Symmetry: D2
Subunit: 120 residues, 4 copies
């Protein structure tokens, strides 16, 4: 079975740490991003999400509230287990920027992907 | 200031209730989707997210753990308030399906938009 | 049958003209966006795409080469016709910006939606 | 300078062949996908797109009209050149399925990524 609890890094070098997953599948953690709009401002930021519980290869989502900007990112994906027992999180994300008013809303959402593997 | 707490409907007729937002911007709620892969199966599903606290028009994200499928959706967006105090949540979402293994990962993520307005 | 040829406006006030669709479903046109990173720079920009030919409500895609920036947008969607013969193009888009090298690739893609209706 | 003319493969094993890029940046070609909704039906399919011309690392987009389904895919991205002169296309895509009517439109768009390198 795949539990998101533990430390993970992604293909861009970001690191996240996820705490205990409760019986609802909820989890909290922290996220240290390797990249940002203004990288000189990067600080460790909180995340909160939910994974499925029964499935051996659960889907999940989480939100990262960046502590150094007005933006928010959400990730969703699935945890896969190899024939050798290795775990990979395949994710896609949306990064929402803050804009001044609704006339700028069209430009406020970036999309991307990330693969994560366990630190140790 | 644009608040997320309350009852919302979107342009597809889905409804959600968001409970009290804590000092860290964290919130829970319940989502009733009007649309699904198998609409006869739809049941109420929990959501968990984070908004920014200081901003008058905060960005936010949340995860919906569907209680009737193996899928997960994440939403991110911004709460806008117009001249008359009317709120709109402008959101984009990713809907993650469960696939059998990593070779099917390519097909697992749907994308879309939703605009939410306050019920009553 | 839902036709793409003609003049269209979207929910943001952008307009486009699509010319004759050939036997392979290929079409050209001109796009005038109402919105840009630098709106004072906006000029008419060419589009080139393909639709399906047999379908009454075809899917399609097209590329807009912005003539005033280094960016490119792609749109994909479907042409729907209601009971009264009114057409709507339901689309999603990706807007690709130019970045300096691959280490910035993560931030280069915006996503959104647009609904188009026929002018006159 | 980066010209899309030539043969490319992506990280999933798909292959595409792009013909001459004209002075407008337009190009045609073919695309043999490694994966599909119904892979037993896969046939070689046409593509049509536009790249930027002046830039050494141009952005671009193209549409693939699948010849074996009612779907359409669009790709957009950028061609990067290494310090060693190696070229990579970094892309994201939207895959549009045909649905019966507008009430199903919400579920019709998948999103993903692909990296391409030259065949030879």
């Amino acid at each position: 079975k795949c539990s998101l609890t533990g430390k993970w890094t992604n293909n861009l070098g970001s690191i996240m740490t996820i705490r205990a997953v409760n019986s609802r599948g909820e989890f909290t953690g922290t996220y240290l991003t390797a990249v940002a709009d203004n990288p000189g401002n990067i600080t460790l930021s909180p995340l909160l999400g939910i994974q499925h519980k029964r499935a051996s290869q659960p889907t999940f989502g989480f939100t990262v509230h960046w502590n150094f900007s007005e933006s928010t990112t959400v990730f969703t994906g699935q945890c896969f287990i190899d024939r050798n027992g290795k775990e990979v999180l395949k994710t896609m994300w949306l990064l929402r920027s803050s804009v001044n008013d609704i006339s700028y809303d069209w430009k406020a959402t970036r999309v991307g992907y990330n693969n994560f593997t366990r630190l140790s």
